[PDB]
């Protein structure tokens, strides 16, 4: 109530602009994304402009409570609603402005992948390396990494990412910038999420490509030895450079199918041209080759592409990342192993994928320790991914969980990093902090430490303070 | 007996090609670096050629005794004689040609810096990227890294030597390359004191430089506030990336003076032209610019400079290291406190000095992984030596780890990298390994477990295999 009166003057009165507990939408509004972790905040407020984060950022340290942002909700652990935390929902900053002559962007973070898009084309056939799934909110996702169809060829969005507008733990406003506040500058892009909140973002662009070709390569059958076949090229192929930078290369596996899939930026000519199947030793079932001028319709269609598969919806389910490297690539026993324990374990899903996203290219150009993001010589991630048409049961953890034993199990003992955007709530907030930020972890408590003392901006796996 | 018999068998029965502790000879021979951390191996063995340290090495292992080769004798802990280890003397292994097609050299590791400069100028005006001081070992040094004067023109010396020659572990003798047994390779561009003796290298050279320009600005004077705004001056300098890439930018500090070193490539109206003076503060009591055209006459003043600097030569000394970044550029606010505790400590020395040298350039043309070296994103190193009259003392050091520290105060807890070829023995193990080679200590010791499962060569703070 001390802390439910000043909530409703951060939101200068509006009471539809904050809400608590009691009421009974509360629990559609908390808008959980992932449906086993459900959350109840504190509150939840959705602030105008900036001064509103401020003032309600107070409300919260006036109380002792936490805090954490939500822009676009695609949290696994819905960390956005973290439960006891202030929500501060950012729905409303989706401001977006254009310079014809830098080509800076000027977006708020409830801005979602799909309007950058959209924006950023037709404000002059712009775009910049970003996710697929349209409806990922920026604020969340800039300041994880985000990678995508063009990171390969530009790196991750937030290497295009020039300032940014951050309110801190004690309600100042400031900014960012690899000039100004060098080492919060550092933190926002990799860690945003523990150390402020980001208002606004000043993110450079690129122009958009000419021709964008899409490509699917299938192989059905559910034979171990015929799917590590598939994976071994494709990772050889990748670790080959043998492959073009500026193209996008992905591979999914699902129960019955293996999906050697991506983009190329070029003519279809070319593409077909490096007769990419050819280097498989089966060929491919099914063939689906498309290329796309309009960049806005090559990008939305690849939304709709994962939203379809099903595993793009919030649902039930559970879902892990591990970052392999070339001191890592997976052996030659171990891939068998792997798709045997795929096939034979007892995975508890209505549908499962596990997706390969090769992230080299433009995205080594940027130091490990020039972003709190330290994974930058990673060969390809790996995400893999259980829904279950249930609630959630400890069998399909055991079946991911496992998932990741077996796939480093050519080398247990060596370190395997994840992405911070697919966190994973199911695993000790040490093993976390260590996957996430690697070595970065460390500069990172420095950062804290110093602007948010407290822990103001507070997760299950957010970078805690120094002792 | 059964040792010394086969021993003198694998010198070809050459009873001067061998040496027992019970020699009066035997001091000597071993021909300690460090006057203090004095050794006593159980053998020394002088082999003509690979057949000969092939089977030397299988002497010591079939008596399991462990081995370390000695070439040049600079390692500050004196490991290429550890007590009671085999000690490979690799005098007789000073082969040299120079196809002149290539420009690529063949030589072998007996061959002292000052020889090497000499024969490859002699042969066709070729040099190759090295460190100063002639009477360092090309056989523990092209295997540490070896930087000196050309590195951030022309890379670290480990940058071009091509292929080697190794003997493992097995008494097995194998070559390597980027094309072949590359996991060695790896780590004989690094940490080759710990997974083989290379008997034979393949370096390509550059051709010399038409003109260097030797330079030198002192600042006599302890006023420890006056030498701090030198270096603070001097670490904003370099970190500006104003200065040229072919130009060499060494500082050193002692008890009264902080002579700012360095050569240039070029004509001499430019580096003068450049003002290196004028970004300065105070201005500095004297100042020298010697242009050697005759490159072999350049390196050779510089090398018998450092010789009476006083500090390259054997005797009782103690000495460290410390390698600095963008990330952890000494404060202003500890900078101070540098001096003021160099000013103020009974440094129970006779001689001190702390020489910081630029890096850069052209060493960040190579990723941290592509080489057992793994300080390739660094701004400067740091060497402290501290000289004795007569044994060491605790005094003295203290005096250099109470230094390491003052330094640190920084950022007391940040990554801070030593250089494996200033080794330092002062330290716990565990301290050493993370600070020589950090990311890659694991891959490393994934190829020692590979080639040399039983640890033969091994030292003080060699690469263990894994657990
Ligand atoms: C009190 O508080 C409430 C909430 O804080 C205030 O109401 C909020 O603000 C506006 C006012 O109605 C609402 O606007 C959004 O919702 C509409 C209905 O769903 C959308 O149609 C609308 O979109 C259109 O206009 C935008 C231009 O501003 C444009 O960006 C839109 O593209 C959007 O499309 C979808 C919508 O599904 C979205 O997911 C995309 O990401 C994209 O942004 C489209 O052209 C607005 O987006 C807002 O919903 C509403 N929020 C509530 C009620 O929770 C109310 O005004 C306050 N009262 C005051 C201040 O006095
Ligand atoms: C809300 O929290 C914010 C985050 O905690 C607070 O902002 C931080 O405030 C501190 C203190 O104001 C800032 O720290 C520095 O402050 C000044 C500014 O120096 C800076 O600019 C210089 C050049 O323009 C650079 O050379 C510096 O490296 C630095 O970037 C400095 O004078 C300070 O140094 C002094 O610090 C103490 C005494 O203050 C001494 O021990 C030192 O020896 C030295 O004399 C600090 O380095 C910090 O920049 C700022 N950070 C951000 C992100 O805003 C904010 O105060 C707080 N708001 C409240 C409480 O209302
Ligand atoms: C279906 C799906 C597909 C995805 N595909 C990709 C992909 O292809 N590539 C990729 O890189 N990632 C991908 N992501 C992951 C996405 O990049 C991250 O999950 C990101 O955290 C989501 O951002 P959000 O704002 O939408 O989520 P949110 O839950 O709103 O935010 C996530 C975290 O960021 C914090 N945060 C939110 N807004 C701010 C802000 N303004 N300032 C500071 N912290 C803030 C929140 O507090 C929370 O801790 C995908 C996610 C989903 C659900
Ligand atoms: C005065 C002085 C100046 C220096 N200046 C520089 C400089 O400017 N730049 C720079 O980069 N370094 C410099 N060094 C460092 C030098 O590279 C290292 O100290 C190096 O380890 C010593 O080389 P060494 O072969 O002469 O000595 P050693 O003690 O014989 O060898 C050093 C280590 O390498 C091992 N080793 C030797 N030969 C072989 C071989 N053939 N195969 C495998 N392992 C072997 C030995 O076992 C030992 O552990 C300097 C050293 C000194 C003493
Ligand atoms: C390993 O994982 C794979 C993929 O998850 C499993 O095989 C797949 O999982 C399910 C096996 O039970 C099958 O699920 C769905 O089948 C049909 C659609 O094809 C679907 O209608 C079923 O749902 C219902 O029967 O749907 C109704 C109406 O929608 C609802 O009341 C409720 O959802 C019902 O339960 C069912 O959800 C799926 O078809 C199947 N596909 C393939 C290609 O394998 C393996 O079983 C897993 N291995 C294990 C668990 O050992
Ligand atoms: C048996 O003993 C030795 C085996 O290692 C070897 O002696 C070495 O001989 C070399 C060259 O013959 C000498 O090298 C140099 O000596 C002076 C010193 O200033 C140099 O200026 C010269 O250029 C010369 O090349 C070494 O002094 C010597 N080393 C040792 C340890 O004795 C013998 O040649 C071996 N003899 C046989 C028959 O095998
Ligand atoms: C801090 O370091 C200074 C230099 O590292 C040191 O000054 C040096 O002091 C020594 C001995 O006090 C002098 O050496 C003298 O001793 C030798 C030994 O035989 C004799 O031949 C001579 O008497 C010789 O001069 C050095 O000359 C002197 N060097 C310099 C540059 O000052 C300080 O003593 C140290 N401060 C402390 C320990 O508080
Ligand atoms: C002495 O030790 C040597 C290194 O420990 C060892 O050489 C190693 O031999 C293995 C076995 O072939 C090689 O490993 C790979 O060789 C090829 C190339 O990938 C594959 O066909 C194999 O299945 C295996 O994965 C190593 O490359 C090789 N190491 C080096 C440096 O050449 C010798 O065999 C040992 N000699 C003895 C015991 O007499
Ligand atoms: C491609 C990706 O990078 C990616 C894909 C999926 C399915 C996901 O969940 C996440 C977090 C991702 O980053
Ligand atoms: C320019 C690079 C110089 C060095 O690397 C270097 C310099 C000194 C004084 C030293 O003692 C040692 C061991 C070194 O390696
Ligand atoms: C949520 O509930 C409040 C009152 O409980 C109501 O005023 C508000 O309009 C509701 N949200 C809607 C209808 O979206
Ligand atoms: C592309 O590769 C296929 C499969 O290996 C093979 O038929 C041929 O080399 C290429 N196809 C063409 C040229 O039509
Ligand atoms: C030292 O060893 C023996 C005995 O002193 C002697 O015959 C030999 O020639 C000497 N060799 C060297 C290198 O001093
Ligand atoms: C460098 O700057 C000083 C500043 O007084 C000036 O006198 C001098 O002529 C300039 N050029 C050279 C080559 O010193």
């Not at 506040?181 to 892009?189: C, G, K, T």
């Not at 460390?442 to 804290?448: A, E």
């Amino acid at each position: 109530s001390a802390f439910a009166t000043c909530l409703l003057a951060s939101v200068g009165g509006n009471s539809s602009a904050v809400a608590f507990p009691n009421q009974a939408n509360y629990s559609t509004l908390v808008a959980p994304y992932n449906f086993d972790l459900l959350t109840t905040p504190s509150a939840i407020v959705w602030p105008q402009d900036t001064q509103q984060v401020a003032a309600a950022v107070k409300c919260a340290v006036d109380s002792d409570i936490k805090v954490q942002p939500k822009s676009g909700g695609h949290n696994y652990g819905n960390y956005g609603s973290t439960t006891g935390e202030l929500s501060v929902n950012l729905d409303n900053l989706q401001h977006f402005s254009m310079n014809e002559t830098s080509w800076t962007a000027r977006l708020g973070p409830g801005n979602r992948l799909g309007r950058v898009t959209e924006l950023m084309y037709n404000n002059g056939g712009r775009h910049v390396p970003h996710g697929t799934t349209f409806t990922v909110g920026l604020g969340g996702h800039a300041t994880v990494g985000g990678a995508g169809a063009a990171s390969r060829m530009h790196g991750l969005l937030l290497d295009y990412v020039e300032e940014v507008e951050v309110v801190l733990a004690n309600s100042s406003i400031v900014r960012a910038s690899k000039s100004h506040n060098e080492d919060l500058f550092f933190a926002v892009r990799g860690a945003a999420s523990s150390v402020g909140i980001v208002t606004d973002f000043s993110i450079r662009t690129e122009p958009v490509p000419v021709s964008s070709v899409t490509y699917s390569y299938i192989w059905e059958g559910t034979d171990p030895a015929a799917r590590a076949e598939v994976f071994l090229t494709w990772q050889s192929l990748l670790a080959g450079g043998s492959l073009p930078q500026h193209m996008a290369y992905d591979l999914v596996a699902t129960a019955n199918s293996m999906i050697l899939g991506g983009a190329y930026f070029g003519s279809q000519e070319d593409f077909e041209a490096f007769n990419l199947s050819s280097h498989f030793k089966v060929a491919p079932d099914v063939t689906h080759i498309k290329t796309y001028t309009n960049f806005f319709d090559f990008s939305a269609a690849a939304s709709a592409q994962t939203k379809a598969a099903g595993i793009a919806s919030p649902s039930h389910f559970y879902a892990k990342s591990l970052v392999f490297n070339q001191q890592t690539l997976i052996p030659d026993d171990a891939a068998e192993e792997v798709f045997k324990y795929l096939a034979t374990t007892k995975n508890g899903t209505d549908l499962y994928a596990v997706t390969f996203a090769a992230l080299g290219g433009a995205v080594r150009d940027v130091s490990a320790s020039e972003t709190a993001f330290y994974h930058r010589d990673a060969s390809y991630f790996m995400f893999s991914f259980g829904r279950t048409s249930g609630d959630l049961t400890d069998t399909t953890v055991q079946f991911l969980d496992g998932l990741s034993e077996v796939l480093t199990s050519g080398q247990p003992d060596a370190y395997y990093g994840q992405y911070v955007g697919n966190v994973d709530p199911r695993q000790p907030t040490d093993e976390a902090l260590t996957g996430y930020y690697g070595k970065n972890l460390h500069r990172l408590q420095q950062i804290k430490s110093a602007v948010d003392p407290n822990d103001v901006f507070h997760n299950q796996q957010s970078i805690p303070p120094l002792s």
